[PDB]
Structure formats: structure tokens, C-alpha cells
């Protein structure tokens, strides 16, 4: 009745922050952490089996391959797909720095979604 | 805000189960029957040589330790004046004339990989 | 309380000077210094760990080899021995005199181009 | 009229103790030997220019003041016509071609930081 629904989060990262805000975000973190890759990791739009994670923004050291990042997200989530830009599978031995070079967004973030296989 | 990931400092062996590594060796043997699977990493306390990016190597059966030493020396861009040691299983010093197929059958790990570590002279 | 590292202009040498300009730069410096090799040394585009070099254009005596050049640039960047620095031409033998590397690896414009990174690639 | 809200604002030196700052520098010296630690703040009575996104900077040794001025003008997103002065210890350096590593050796503060203030007027 008189209860208020207090909650996050209707919108994704790109919907909650403007392009100019995201560009400056990436600039600052790359200037402060030059050897880390800024990764946005969100739940796939359709997903309902896997749970939502507390945090969506990750600083990933250059040399960590996708396999270790997948393991880290698996543990944080407590059949798993980590899809770059919402659709792309990458070889799990690719270092995150190489994924960044080829798949980074125009805003400078690297976007990934996780989803049940 | 941002979650900072601390990278694992585990070696190749520590990152994979025995089942996984034995399977790896089998597949390598299937697809590369004339190659020795060699894991080469930096000596744990090394301070006079940098870390190489690649640690997983496929080495032809017929070469000697000297040829493998020269290949890794060149990846490191080392000078002739610069001492360099390749320790099998982190502690075994092999005659450079020894064929690698011989080092493999004699020093390979239980998992089927041949493990080596590289170090400078100042480390000793 | 985290520092911001500043970067000066990161336009590459080939973006800063046209082909015709670079050919003329080489013609002039080679007639001025016939025993020296004109070398362009630049940080790899993806490299962030190593600092940017203060200069791009180097005149390297004919007899100096890559091993000595690497030592000199490592000192210019104030690197410690355990820090990775890999210097790639446009890998070549580090004992070869740069005059011989120049003859076999020089660019169409007459410069010898090198790039450095924290990985051997 | 308008009510002018004027609250005091702490500078970097008022936010961090000398022992905090002097150790920050000594450590930056170890980790970034080719860089100069610079504090850049807006002049307290500045009436035109906006606030810079950050205060603590590492500047490569070879960058001269002319280059640094161009970099900060870009960070502030200024029009070309907007006046901008980058004052080292409150004064403009006559040579804008001296490497900041040399500026550091004559202008650093006791804590090891090199302090700059920017303003739209040189006096």
C-alpha cells in the first residue's frame, strides 16, 4: 500500500552515464592505472538463471588472460559465457590487453556480458 | 566503484589440474608428434632478467639443449657477455650437448611436460 | 590521491612528417654524418608500462650493435635490470652492427624504424 | 542582488601533512624516476577559468612549460582566445622551453612537489 519500492537498477552502464562522462571516466582511470584495462561486466539482457553481481566495473591487469577473468567472475557469481560487446566469444588464452585493443568501445571501455550457455 | 583484480601469481602447473595437463600433453602429442612440450618460466627470485611473455613452447625432437638455450637467449635479446642458465625442474643443470629428446624422456614431469626455469649468473 | 600521468603529443613520426619530408631529412643527415645511421625509436602503440622516450630521432654510429643500443636506451629510460624492454626493428641479431641492420631493414624513406614494448611479442 | 556563497576551500597543502607529502614524493621518485611530481591548482581568486579535473600530476622529465601549458589548456577545454597562465610558485617562467626536470631542480618545494597555480591574469 504505502510501501515504497527502493532499488537499483533499471538501466545499463551506457544508459546511466553520458558518452562524455564515460570518455572522461576512461581517461582518468587510464592515466592513474596505465597497465589496467577498464572492463564493464553486466548480465545479459535475457538472463534469468544466473544472478546479478554487486559490481559491474572492473580494473583488469594487462596480462590476465580471459580464462582467469572468467574464473574470477565465476567465483564472484558463486555453463558460463562471457561475451565481449554482448555477442563475441574470444579465445580464453587471449590476454585482456589484446581484447581491449581490438574490441574496446568508442568511449574507451571494454564491454562484456555474462550469460548462461 | 571499480573492482581492482589482483592477478594470480600461480605457475603453469599450479593453474591446471593433473587431468588437464595430461590431456594437454596427449593433444600436443596427437597434433605435434615431432615436438617436445616445454614449459619455460623465470626463476622465482630472479632480479637481473625480465619476465618473458610466452612460457609454453613446442620444441623439435632433434635439437640439443644448446639450441634451446640460444632460442631463449635471443627472445630475451641477451648479449654475448650475459650469462644465462636453463635449469630443468628448477635445479638440474644439463650438458648443452644433450639432445632434448633425451632430457625429455629422462626429466619430464609425471604429467608429461618438461619444465624449465631460466636464471642469471647473479642469482647464483 | 592517485597521480595522473601526463603524456605529450603521441602522434607517430610518420604522422608528423610526410614521406617527402622524411626522405629529405635522411638525405641531409646522411650527407652531414656519413658514418651514422638515422634511427627512429618509438614506444609501441599498445605499450603503457614503459615510459615515453624524450626524443624520437637518434644518430647511431655504424659500428654500434643492437645490444649496445638497447643498453643505452634502457639507461635513458632509467630502467632496472628486471624491467622488460624489447626493441624490435620494423627480432634481429643483437650482435649485428647497425650499419648492416640499416642496409637490410631500412624503410622506403631511408630511416631505420624501431619500436619498444614490455613483451617480446 | 544575489547572495554570494563563498566557502573556504582547502589547498593540497592544507589537505595533506608535510610528512604525508614528503613521503608521497620520495616514493614517486622510486617508482617513476623519469617523471616530475606536480601539483596544479586554480588560483583562489580566479574569476574566469574552470576547475581542473585533478590536482596531482606526473609529468615526463623532458616536457617543457610550453608543452605543459598546451596540455592543461586542453584538459580545461579552453577556447583559443581564453587567457591562461600557468604560474610556478606564483610566477610565470620566462623560458617555456626549459625541461620540467630542470625547472624542478630550482623550483621544487621543501616537500619535493613542484607547485603550480593557473589563472587568467599573469599579475
Amino acid at each position: 500500500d504505502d510501501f515504497v519500492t527502493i532499488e537499483p537498477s533499471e538501466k545499463t552502464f551506457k544508459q546511466r552515464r553520458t558518452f562524455e562522462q564515460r570518455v572522461e571516466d576512461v581517461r582518468l582511470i587510464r592515466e592513474q592505472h596505465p597497465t589496467k584495462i577498464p572492463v564493464i561486466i553486466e548480465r545479459y539482457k535475457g538472463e534469468k538463471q544466473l544472478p546479478v553481481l554487486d559490481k559491474t566495473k572492473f580494473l583488469v591487469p594487462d596480462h590476465v588472460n580471459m580464462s582467469e577473468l572468467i574464473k574470477i567472475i565465476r567465483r564472484r557469481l558463486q555453463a558460463f559465457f562471457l561475451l565481449v560487446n554482448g555477442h563475441s566469444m574470444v579465445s580464453v588464452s587471449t590476454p585482456i590487453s589484446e581484447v581491449y585493443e581490438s574490441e574496446k568501445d568508442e568511449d574507451g571501455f571494454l564491454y562484456m556480458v555474462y550469460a548462461s550457455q
Side-chain angles (χ1 to χ4, degrees), chain A:
Chain A
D1 43 47
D2 204 26
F3 283 70
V4 315
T5 293
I6 45 144
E7 50 146 333
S9 277
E10 161 155 86
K11 302 163 169 176
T12 66
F13 181 76
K14 269 181 175 192
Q15 297 169 315
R16 295 190 63 195
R17 286 192 78 63
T18 69
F19 180 77
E20 142 182 84
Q21 284 172 338
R22 288 179 265 119
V23 167
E24 163 71 357
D25 289 342
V26 165
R27 161 188 299 110
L28 277 190
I29 77 95
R30 295 280 281 160
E31 285 170 338
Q32 296 169 36
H33 303 95
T35 72
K36 279 159 193 314
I37 304 302
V39 185
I40 304 296
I41 302 176
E42 293 167 308
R43 196 176 65 169
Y44 178 85
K45 254 62 159 285
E47 184 65 25
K48 51 210 54 172
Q49 333 273 340
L50 296 168
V52 161
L53 286 199
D54 198 3
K55 298 297 201 311
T56 47
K57 321 171 57 186
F58 295 85
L59 284 183
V60 180
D62 275 339
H63 61 264
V64 167
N65 299 19
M66 287 292 294
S67 60
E68 193 184 345
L69 184 57
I70 290 170
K71 286 183 216 97
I72 290 163
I73 298 297
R74 174 172 280 272
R75 305 195 321 254
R76 204 163 225 100
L77 277 152
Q78 255 161 318
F80 186 55
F81 275 148
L82 193 54
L83 299 181
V84 182
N85 286 307
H87 71 280
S88 297
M89 295 198 342
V90 299
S91 167
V92 300
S93 59
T94 321
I96 191 76
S97 82
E98 289 207 339
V99 186
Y100 188 65
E101 285 180 307
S102 153
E103 306 290 345
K104 63 183 186 171
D105 193 86
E106 283 84 350
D107 68 7
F109 281 113
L110 178 61
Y111 287 87
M112 304 184 188
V113 297
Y114 62 86
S116 55
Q117 301 198 1

